[PDB]
mmCIF file of C-alpha atoms and ligand atoms in Angstrom:
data_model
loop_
_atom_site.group_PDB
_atom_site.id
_atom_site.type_symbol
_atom_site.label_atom_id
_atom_site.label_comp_id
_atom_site.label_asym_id
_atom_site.label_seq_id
_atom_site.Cartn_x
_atom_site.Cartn_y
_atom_site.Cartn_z
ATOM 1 C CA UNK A 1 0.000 0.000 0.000
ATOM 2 C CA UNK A 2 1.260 3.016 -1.068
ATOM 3 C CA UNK A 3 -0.446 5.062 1.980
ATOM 4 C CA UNK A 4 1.507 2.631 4.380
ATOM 5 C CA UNK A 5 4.403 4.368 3.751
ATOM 6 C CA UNK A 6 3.054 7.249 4.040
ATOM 7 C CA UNK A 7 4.538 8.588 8.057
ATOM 8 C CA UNK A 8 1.505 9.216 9.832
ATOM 9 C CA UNK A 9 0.184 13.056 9.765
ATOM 10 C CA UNK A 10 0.650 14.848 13.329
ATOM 11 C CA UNK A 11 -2.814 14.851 14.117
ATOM 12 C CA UNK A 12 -3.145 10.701 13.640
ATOM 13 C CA UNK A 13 0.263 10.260 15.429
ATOM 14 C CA UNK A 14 -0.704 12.235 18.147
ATOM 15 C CA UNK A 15 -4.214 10.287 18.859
ATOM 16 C CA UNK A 16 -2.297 7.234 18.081
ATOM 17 C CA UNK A 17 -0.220 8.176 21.313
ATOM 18 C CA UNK A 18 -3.244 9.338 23.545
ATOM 19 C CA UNK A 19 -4.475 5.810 23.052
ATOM 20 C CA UNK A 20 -1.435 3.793 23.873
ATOM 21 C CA UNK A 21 -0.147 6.040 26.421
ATOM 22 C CA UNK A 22 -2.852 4.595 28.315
ATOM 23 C CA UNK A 23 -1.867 0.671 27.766
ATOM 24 C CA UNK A 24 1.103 1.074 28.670
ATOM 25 C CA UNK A 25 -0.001 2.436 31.719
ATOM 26 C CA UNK A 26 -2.781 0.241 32.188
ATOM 27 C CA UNK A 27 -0.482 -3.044 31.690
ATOM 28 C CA UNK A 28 1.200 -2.718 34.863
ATOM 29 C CA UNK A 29 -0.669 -4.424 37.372
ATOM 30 C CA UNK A 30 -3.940 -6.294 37.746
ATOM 31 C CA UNK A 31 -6.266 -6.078 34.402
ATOM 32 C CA UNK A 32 -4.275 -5.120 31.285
ATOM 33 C CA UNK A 33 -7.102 -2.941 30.172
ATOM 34 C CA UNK A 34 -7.470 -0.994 32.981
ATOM 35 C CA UNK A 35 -5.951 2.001 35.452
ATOM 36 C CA UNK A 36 -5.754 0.514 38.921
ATOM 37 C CA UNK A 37 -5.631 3.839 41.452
ATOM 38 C CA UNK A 38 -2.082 3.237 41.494
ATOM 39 C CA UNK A 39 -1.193 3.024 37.633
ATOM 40 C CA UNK A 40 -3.327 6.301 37.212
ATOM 41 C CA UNK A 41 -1.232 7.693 39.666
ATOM 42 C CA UNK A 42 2.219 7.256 37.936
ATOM 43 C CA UNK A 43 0.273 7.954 34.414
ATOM 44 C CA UNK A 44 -0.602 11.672 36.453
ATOM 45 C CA UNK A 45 2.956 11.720 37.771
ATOM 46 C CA UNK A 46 4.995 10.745 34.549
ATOM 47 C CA UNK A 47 3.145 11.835 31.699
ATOM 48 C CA UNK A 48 0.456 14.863 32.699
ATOM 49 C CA UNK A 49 2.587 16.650 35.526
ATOM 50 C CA UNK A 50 1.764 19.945 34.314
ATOM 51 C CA UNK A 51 -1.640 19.646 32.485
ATOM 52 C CA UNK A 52 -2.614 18.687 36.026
ATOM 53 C CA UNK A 53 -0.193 20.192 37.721
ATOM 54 C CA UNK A 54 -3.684 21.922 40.536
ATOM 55 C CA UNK A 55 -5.603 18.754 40.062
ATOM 56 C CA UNK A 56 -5.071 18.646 44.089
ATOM 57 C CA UNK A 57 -5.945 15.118 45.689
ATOM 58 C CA UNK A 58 -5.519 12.420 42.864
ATOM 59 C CA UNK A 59 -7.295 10.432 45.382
ATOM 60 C CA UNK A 60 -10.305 11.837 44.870
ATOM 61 C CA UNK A 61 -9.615 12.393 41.277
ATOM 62 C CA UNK A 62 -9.508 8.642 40.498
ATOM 63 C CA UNK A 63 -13.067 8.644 42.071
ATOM 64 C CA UNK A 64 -14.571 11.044 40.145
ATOM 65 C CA UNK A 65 -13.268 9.556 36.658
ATOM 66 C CA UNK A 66 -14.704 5.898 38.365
ATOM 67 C CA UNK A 67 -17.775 6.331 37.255
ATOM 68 C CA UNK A 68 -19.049 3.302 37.363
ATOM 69 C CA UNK A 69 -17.396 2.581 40.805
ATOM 70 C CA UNK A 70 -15.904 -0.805 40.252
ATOM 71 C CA UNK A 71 -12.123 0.699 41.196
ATOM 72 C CA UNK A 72 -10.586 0.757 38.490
ATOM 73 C CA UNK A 73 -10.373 3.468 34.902
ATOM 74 C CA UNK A 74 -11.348 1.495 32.176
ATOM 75 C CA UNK A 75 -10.464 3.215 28.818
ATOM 76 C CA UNK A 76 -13.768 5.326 28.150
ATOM 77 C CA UNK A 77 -13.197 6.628 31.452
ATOM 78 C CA UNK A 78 -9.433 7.486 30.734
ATOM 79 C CA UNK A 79 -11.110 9.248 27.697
ATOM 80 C CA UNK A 80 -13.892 11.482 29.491
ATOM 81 C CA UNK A 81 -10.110 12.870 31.237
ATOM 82 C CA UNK A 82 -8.253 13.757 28.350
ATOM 83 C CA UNK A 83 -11.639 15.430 26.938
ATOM 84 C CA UNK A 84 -11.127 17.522 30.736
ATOM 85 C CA UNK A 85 -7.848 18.400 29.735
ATOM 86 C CA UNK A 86 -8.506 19.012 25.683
ATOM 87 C CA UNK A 87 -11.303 21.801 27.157
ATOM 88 C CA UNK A 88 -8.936 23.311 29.627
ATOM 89 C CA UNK A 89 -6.476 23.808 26.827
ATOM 90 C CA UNK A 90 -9.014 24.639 24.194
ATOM 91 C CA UNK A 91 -9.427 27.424 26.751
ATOM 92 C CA UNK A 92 -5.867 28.600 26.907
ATOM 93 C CA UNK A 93 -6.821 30.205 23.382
ATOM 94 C CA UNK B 1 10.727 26.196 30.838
ATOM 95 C CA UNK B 2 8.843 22.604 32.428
ATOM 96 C CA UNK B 3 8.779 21.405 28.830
ATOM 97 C CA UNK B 4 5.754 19.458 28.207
ATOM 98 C CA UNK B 5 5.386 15.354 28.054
ATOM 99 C CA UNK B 6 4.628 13.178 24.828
ATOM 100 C CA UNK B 7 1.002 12.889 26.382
ATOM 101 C CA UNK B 8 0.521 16.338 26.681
ATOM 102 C CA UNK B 9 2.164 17.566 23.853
ATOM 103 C CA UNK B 10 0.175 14.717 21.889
ATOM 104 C CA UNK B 11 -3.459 16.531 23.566
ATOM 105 C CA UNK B 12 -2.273 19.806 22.651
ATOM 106 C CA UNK B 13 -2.093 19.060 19.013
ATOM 107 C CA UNK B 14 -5.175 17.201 18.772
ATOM 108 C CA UNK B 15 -6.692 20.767 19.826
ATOM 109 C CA UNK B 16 -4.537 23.630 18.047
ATOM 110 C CA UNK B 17 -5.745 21.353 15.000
ATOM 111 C CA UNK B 18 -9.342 21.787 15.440
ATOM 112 C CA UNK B 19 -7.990 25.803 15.543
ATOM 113 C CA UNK B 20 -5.804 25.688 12.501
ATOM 114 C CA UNK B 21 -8.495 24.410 10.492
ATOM 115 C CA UNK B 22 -11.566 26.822 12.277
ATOM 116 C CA UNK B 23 -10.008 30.300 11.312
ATOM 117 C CA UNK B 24 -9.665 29.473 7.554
ATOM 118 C CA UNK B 25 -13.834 30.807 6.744
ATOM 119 C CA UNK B 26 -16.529 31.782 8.740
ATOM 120 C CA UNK B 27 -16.299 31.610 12.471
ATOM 121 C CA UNK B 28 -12.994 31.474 13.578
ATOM 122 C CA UNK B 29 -14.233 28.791 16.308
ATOM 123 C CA UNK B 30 -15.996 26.332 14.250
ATOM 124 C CA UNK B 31 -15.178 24.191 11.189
ATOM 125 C CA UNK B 32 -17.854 24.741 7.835
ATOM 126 C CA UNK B 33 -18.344 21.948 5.713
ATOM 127 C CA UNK B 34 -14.910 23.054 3.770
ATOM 128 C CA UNK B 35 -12.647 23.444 6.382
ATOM 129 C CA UNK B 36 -13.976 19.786 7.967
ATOM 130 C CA UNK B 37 -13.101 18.619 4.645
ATOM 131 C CA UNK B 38 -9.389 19.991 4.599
ATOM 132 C CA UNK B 39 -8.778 18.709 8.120
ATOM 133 C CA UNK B 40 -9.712 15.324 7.130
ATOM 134 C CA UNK B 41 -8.115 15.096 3.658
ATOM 135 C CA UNK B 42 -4.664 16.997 5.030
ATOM 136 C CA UNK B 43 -4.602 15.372 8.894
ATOM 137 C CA UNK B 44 -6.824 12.318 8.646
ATOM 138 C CA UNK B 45 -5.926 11.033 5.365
ATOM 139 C CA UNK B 46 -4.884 7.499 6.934
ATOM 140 C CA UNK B 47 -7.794 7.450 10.287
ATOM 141 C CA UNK B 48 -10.364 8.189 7.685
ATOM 142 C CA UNK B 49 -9.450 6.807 4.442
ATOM 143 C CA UNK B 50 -12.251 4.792 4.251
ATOM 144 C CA UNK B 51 -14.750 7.452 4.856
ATOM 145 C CA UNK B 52 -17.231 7.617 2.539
ATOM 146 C CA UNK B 53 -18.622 11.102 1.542
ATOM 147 C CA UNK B 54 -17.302 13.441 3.758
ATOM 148 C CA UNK B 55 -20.431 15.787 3.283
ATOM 149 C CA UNK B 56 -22.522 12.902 4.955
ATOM 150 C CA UNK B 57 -20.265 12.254 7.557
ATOM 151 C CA UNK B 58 -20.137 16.506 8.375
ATOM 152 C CA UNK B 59 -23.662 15.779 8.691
ATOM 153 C CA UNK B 60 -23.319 12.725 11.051
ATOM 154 C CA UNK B 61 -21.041 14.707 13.447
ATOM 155 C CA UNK B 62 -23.338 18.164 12.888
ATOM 156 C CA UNK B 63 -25.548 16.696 15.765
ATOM 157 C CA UNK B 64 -26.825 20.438 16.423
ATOM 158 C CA UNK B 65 -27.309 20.826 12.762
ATOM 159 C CA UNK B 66 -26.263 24.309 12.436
ATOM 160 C CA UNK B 67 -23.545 23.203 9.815
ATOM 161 C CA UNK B 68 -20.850 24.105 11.592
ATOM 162 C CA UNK B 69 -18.858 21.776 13.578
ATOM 163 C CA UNK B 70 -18.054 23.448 17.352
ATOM 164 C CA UNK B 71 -14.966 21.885 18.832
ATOM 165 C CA UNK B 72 -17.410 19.297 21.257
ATOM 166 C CA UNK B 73 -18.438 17.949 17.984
ATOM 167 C CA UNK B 74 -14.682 17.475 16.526
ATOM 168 C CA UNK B 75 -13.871 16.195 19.773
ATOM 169 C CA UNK B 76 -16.744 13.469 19.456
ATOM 170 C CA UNK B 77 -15.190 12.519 16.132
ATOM 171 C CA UNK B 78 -11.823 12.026 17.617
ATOM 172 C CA UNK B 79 -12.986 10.079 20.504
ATOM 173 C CA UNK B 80 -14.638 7.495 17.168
ATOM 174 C CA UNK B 81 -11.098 7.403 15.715
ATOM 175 C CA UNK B 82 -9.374 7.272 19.267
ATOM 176 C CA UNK B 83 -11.840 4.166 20.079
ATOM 177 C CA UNK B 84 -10.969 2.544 16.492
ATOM 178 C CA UNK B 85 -6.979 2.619 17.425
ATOM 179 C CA UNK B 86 -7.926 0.778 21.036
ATOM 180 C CA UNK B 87 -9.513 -2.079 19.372
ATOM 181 C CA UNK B 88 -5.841 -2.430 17.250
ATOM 182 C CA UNK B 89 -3.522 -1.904 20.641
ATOM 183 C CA UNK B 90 -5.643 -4.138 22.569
ATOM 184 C CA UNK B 91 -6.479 -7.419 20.281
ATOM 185 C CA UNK B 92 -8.627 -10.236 21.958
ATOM 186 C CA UNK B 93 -7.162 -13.420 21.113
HETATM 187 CA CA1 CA C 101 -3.987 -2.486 35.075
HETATM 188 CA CA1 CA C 102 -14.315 2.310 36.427
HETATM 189 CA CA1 CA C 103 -14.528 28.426 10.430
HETATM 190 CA CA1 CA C 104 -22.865 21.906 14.951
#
């Protein structure tokens, strides 16, 4: 295919890395396709230090993305956060 | 000066594109029918190949049907494509 050699455009690479940010994250511990509180925590720590930088207890932050309370950030839930942080930063313009 | 992570970085591109694309016609904060069209043919040519018309799909993401596409409704069509690349990094055997 002449498109697969194509590099992918900035826009695709950078969703491409949204989504796999979060496996690599979520592969640590437990369920593969999940956040435990504690794999959120080092995803927060390591990779969105600034964008949440006043986020203040992460704690309480992990409940409020739990939405359906079973412990754990499944993707869609890891989603509804970076569409938090997209606004913020939509904002910022 | 705290320079920004790959998952950041990533998020802030997926939103100055939305931007880039907005300020060509029109409202500067909202994409017509052309500019939607130029985002997807110059920054989606690979997530949306097989699109079909892109005047129907416009539509499909118009949900407020005001032909213009607000950056909630962009953001809804990069959560589809972001959703499309988690089914790929996270096969079921
Ligand atoms: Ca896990
Ligand atoms: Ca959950
Ligand atoms: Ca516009
Ligand atoms: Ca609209």
């Amino acid at each position: 295919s002449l498109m697969a050699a194509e590099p992918l455009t900035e826009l695709e690479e950078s969703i491409e890395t949204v989504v796999t940010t979060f496996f690599t994250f979520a592969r640590q511990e437990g369920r593969k396709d999940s956040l435990s509180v504690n794999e959120f925590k080092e995803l927060v720590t390591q990779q969105l230090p600034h964008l949440l930088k006043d986020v203040g207890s992460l704690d309480e932050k992990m409940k409020s993305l739990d939405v359906n309370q079973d412990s754990e950030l499944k993707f869609n839930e890891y989603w509804r956060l970076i569409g938090e942080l997209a606004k913020e930063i939509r904002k910022k313009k």
